[PDB]
């Protein structure tokens, strides 16, 4: 095949980025246009940034080669969070023009360092919202496409359950009205090591009414095969009297060398097999690190399991250490779900949850916003979380499944709002971050000499201020903010009291006053990921098609 | 593949919408042209708005992509009502030009708001016609393509049965004359799961004079095979004394795994077999509350789970001694005792009371119309007309002409009646403009948004389009270049009967439309117009 | 339709300015006939033509309408062009 | 206006409409002819026209307006020549 | 012919301005390229900005239509000053991109007002150099293309004549060496009204050894025809005894109606005709205005002529008023030249010159830099100026005529240096003017509120700073100023002590230290003319080719 080098590679890269920019940005705003996508023998008509980006194709291979670099990182890899794809593609385009305008490796290392300090300001600026706080309604209202009924219901579900964070699942209903099913059941991060250990021996959903769990810390491979044979046969022979089947071996990771050994150990005692169900199930958890160690401790407390460091510790056990539960558990390939929890068990869980809460009470105010505190809060939420199943209804079939997706967007928004944070919407938080970082470095008289040479005198600082405006511009062009003159310009005073427009009502005020908010994680990741992809496109000189 | 953006996409949209408009509109009026459609190696020549719309194709992928947005929503999805497809495409084109003429998001929120107020007037203007009222003949005469014989017969069928709403089915007859079969019986949506369970073991028409029905909610497959064995054997052993054969297991769906199990369960007890008839029949229905109607008719208990068959008693189990006719297509009830009719009428009143306490907007929704469909099933008579004629082709065409008359009269009594000839939309627009302007409270806001803008005046010109197409090239548009409406014409409208050749009021002459058709045309026309106006991008990949 | 045409000149003069700022397009009412609204482009103020001081010669504006009418009618009613 | 009124004729075709258009536009012309202010020599509104036409000249708009106002009864013909001094010089005859 | 409207017109304008920019700018710098121009059947190879500009042609009419707007104002009209044509095209291209970047009439009225305030700083910054000041050598050295011999000679000619400003003419010599001819003779601004009045009756160079001059103030046309007949015949009849022929009627302007009358008046008295020479010559002067009145007063003092307001004043005259000189005068179509001046006449001229000098002594320091003082100095220089004729020599014919042009450039430079002013070269004066204007407006707390809104917050101020750098960039790219990083950036400290590079030597310093200067009039006019042409090009939307 052909090999493209020099000015032509940069020629293609510029064009493809331009076309994708135009198509995805036209979606945003009050004059938000509509994209008409073909699929098979039907027509899907939407204004969703992610769906547009996923579906853009090119005929030429050179063009398609580049297209997979700009869309696909915020499209195919981004499965957990759908929102913040229109933001990322927008920022990529902007920062690409910044790298082209200030060429050479010396400037590039200066751009990357300034943008990095802007990122540090956004993480500081994040407002950590509480469950009882009414602001969640404004976030719910914006994400629901101005739904009065839905935004009221979902906001109430979190507000009424003050203490426990509800896990919400969605199913296609039958009626015109919606129906809510509340259940006191927990979601766990454990799942099958191998599909063989499930019901039907093919990765099915095994339901249980009794078990005896054991939590191991180590990653298990070929080296621990002998320790498992010594461990399993010790409990099956000696301590069979006080043992409810099946025996759950929860750990960090089970390699295929260890899984094959435990398959044969099930076959060794065929008397304990009941209706096909294997009496021994290995269960993995995706954690890693010594931060990740304490998630297995939560798993241990929920199921009355002992914490074990080594695999060989299975031999030295007793009636005091071994405790077989008689509740109800639902094992799964994705995740396991607990249901029946006795009052004796809930006392142990709540006492352990208070122990984590007491650790958070005795830390500094700065460390409350850190990764340590937020992870410890994620521990609590898993330990005290309830399952809710909403069956969404409507007039037709198509109106139901569309309303299901509209519910899922609201859930994802409110979850991440309480989890990560809240920032002033309307493209205002990025303007405040840039204008903050420049003022801080310039005003600080210690490093003012160096800061002026790198950023201010170069014109990088000034060019970066112009880029933060891009989002605010697209939203509020062709309206009464850009009315007095040709274009609206920010000042020193507007940073203290920002100015936007509520498109639903038709009024001018502050985002804090009117109620326009964004999820913090989406906006932060867009800047990080936009910077990386911009750098790659600007610095590519060669395309190989063979 | 290619990606179209900008002025080009809005260029394609305009061209496709134009070509579809021309082909569908030319059909309407006294100078109604004819369309010649190719299908395989044959030729079908028609002037039916729906059939023309369903069959328009384009070569270019871009052109075809747009074509599936203007026709297909009122073509492929619209299966229940065929009528009002010509009208929807017509209003789409009209309202599209209104959106292009007043661009910008601020005007659009004003257009969408005024049109929504016009819709509220049409829903109020609807005349709720009664069974005995002679106006049904005028609706029947128009829908039958000026048939004097057919419009008389179908109008009499509804008029004579004053108190009960007749369900009418059609079959291809043998004679030249028509033959009517009236029956005082109810039609049910249940049918055989497997042909084996019928009389003769080959999907026949089993007639019964006694049964014991049980209504299950769940869809039944291989997972419920054990629950059926536990359920059936519990009733056959314990509660055999108060049990009239056969036992009818009515449910949502019976899979082949479950049907094979219930075949063997019939063979398990050979003592209860009478003249070949199997004592257990699974019955499927193609909507949770439709099974509740099925339960009330046959004195059957409502059951959520299959395992609930075990925990039953003489209080729950009730074996009927009426008359039922099971079938592969549908089941038919006949003999209903005075004790049973009290239970059905009480349940019917419960559905009626729910409709009494809804808003006026929700009365025209799918919710209310489905609940009315529930009532008519619970209180209805069956009539089977066998249509005849001279040839084979003349019979099947007359069958379709009967079906259009039935659909028209059903929806006439159900939904409503409005003055035809493109008059009800003109009255509604001119009414809503005058109401808002005359109301001195909101007159300040109303004038700024609609009147001074020129939206109000442009909307008046649109309502005229249907009246123009119907009565152009005739004696109404004779005096001057174009006919123009005034204040007086709203009180006493002016049309022309094309059959006779006379000028008068739609009320006087007898030209009417079904209300649900004309309202849905404006609702659906507004939505599709808005999408087309606001599209800037076509993705062909 | 004739009311919409009279607006054309006022549109071209004061588009892209603070008269057409509040909404998509400026619309006249009954009150504006008694006290008209323009914009002095030199100064940058809103008021009445009588107040600010914007005037035209009468014979020019009248003859424009008379001459505009005759030439419009001819162009509208022509169906044939002879090039020989 | 040609462009404007051309569209009006195409929008309402046929000879019967045309004679209505022509008659209404004719009545508009009779209004403009009536609305016209036939300004007198002594009238001070000339200063407002002079101030607009001279690109906001306070000195020139005063002098030329006075030249017309002082000669109430005769319409003055004005000639212009390139002078010599800093100041202007007037020669009335 | 065709009519171009819309986006195509702005498309052509952008392309023609790009090509002219590239062709003319490449001339500048140490890596200054060379242009090879075809003329007839020869080849002219040059790096002269003006000659490149005059010669660029296009094939398409639309392209050539635009080309006559960018070049021809600084090319065909600019006959008095050749220098500052490269600079004018340079700034046009820069200011064009500024007007495109901030569109809309409200922005444009702000740009024009800021650039206007920059112009006022350049006129203030100009250093008024004195005759004895050694800086003239540095100006001469730069303008002569690093000639050590020529720059020494021309600088000495002005320095030795401390008191009188020398007028220099150039002629093609015969020898290898140059030869200087100094003459005590004055140059006057009077010239023939009609070619008929000269020697040979066809606009020749009439040489005289006696005359009687009369200076009239008024512009003469058809109205003064009778006053001339009464005037001329009065002197010829009554005061013939004390009258040396010819009679010179010096005035502001002679129209063709008056010239034809005075032709017939010469024919009326055929006895006074000597060897073809007409005894009456009308003489015009291009002045105008009341500033321009006093130049005729200088003309009156030189030739012992009486000052007359009206033409009819010629009648009322006497022996006290009439004074016929017996010196030597050389009349010409371009200009008249005096030569023989008696000691009695030189006393009258020097006394009148002192009268103008005394007026300048009693004015304020601010008014010394004004138009009034500089014009009054131009009066003195005309009244006390000497004629020098240099005959330039060389080895061949082509080397002589090239050296003639190199002399003329040095003369033009030194004349305008003393006349107008001096500014720090190397594209430094524009950067100092812009950075000065921004700082003055921002620091002034009274108008700081308005100044920030229009210029600073808009990003106009910052974008204008980037333009002033353009000249300095072209000159000192690919050298040791732009060595440490990718690009050199100015700071607050560099305005006090600027940084350039002498390309001849190879050293880093201040323009004041090294010795790089420009003429002030050229740099000011480039900014004025560049702004006007830039505005026109940005605001054009239509091309008519018919």
Author numbering:
A (entry chain A), E (entry chain L): 4 to 549
B (entry chain G): 4 to 289, 295 to 549
C (entry chain M): 466 to 549
D (entry chain M): 94 to 186
What does the primary publication say about this deposited structure?
Our structural and functional analysis of the chaperonin ɸEL from the bacteriophage EL of P. aeruginosa revealed that the protein is ATPase active and functions in aggregation prevention of denatured proteins. ɸEL forms tetradecameric double ring complexes, which dissociate into a population of single rings in the presence of ATP and at physiological salt concentration. As anticipated, the ɸEL subunits displayed the typical three-domain architecture of chaperonins, composed of an equatorial domain (residues 2–130 and 425–552), an intermediate domain (residues 131–188 and 388–424), and an apical domain (residues 189–387). The domain structures of ɸEL differ from those of GroEL by numerous insertions and deletions, which alter the putative substrate-binding cleft and the contacts at the ring-ring interface. Our functional data rather suggests that the chaperone mechanism of ɸEL is encapsulation independent, and represents an evolutionary precursor of the more complex encapsulation mechanisms used by the group I and II chaperonins.
To obtain the solution structure of apo-ɸEL, we next performed cryo-EM and single particle analysis. Symmetry-free 3D class averaging indicated a tetradecameric double-ring structure with C2 symmetry. Refinement of the particles resulted in a density map at 3.45 Å resolution, which allowed construction of an atomic model. Apo-ɸEL has an open structure with a ring opening diameter at the apical domains of ~65 Å. In the apo-state, ɸEL is a double ring with six of the seven subunits per ring assuming alternating states (conformations II and III) and one subunit in conformation I. The putative SP binding sites in the apical domains of subunits A, C and E are partially occluded. In all subunits of ɸEL the tip of the αA-β2 loop in the equatorial domain is moved away from the nucleotide binding site as in chains B and D of crystal form II. Other nucleotide binding elements such as the P-loop (residues 79–86) and the β17-β18 hairpin (residues 503–512) are also moved outward (~1.5 Å) in the apo structure. These local conformational changes might facilitate ATP-binding. Similar to group II chaperonins and unlike the staggered subunit contacts in group I, the ring-ring interface of apo-ɸEL is formed by two-fold symmetrical contacts between subunits.
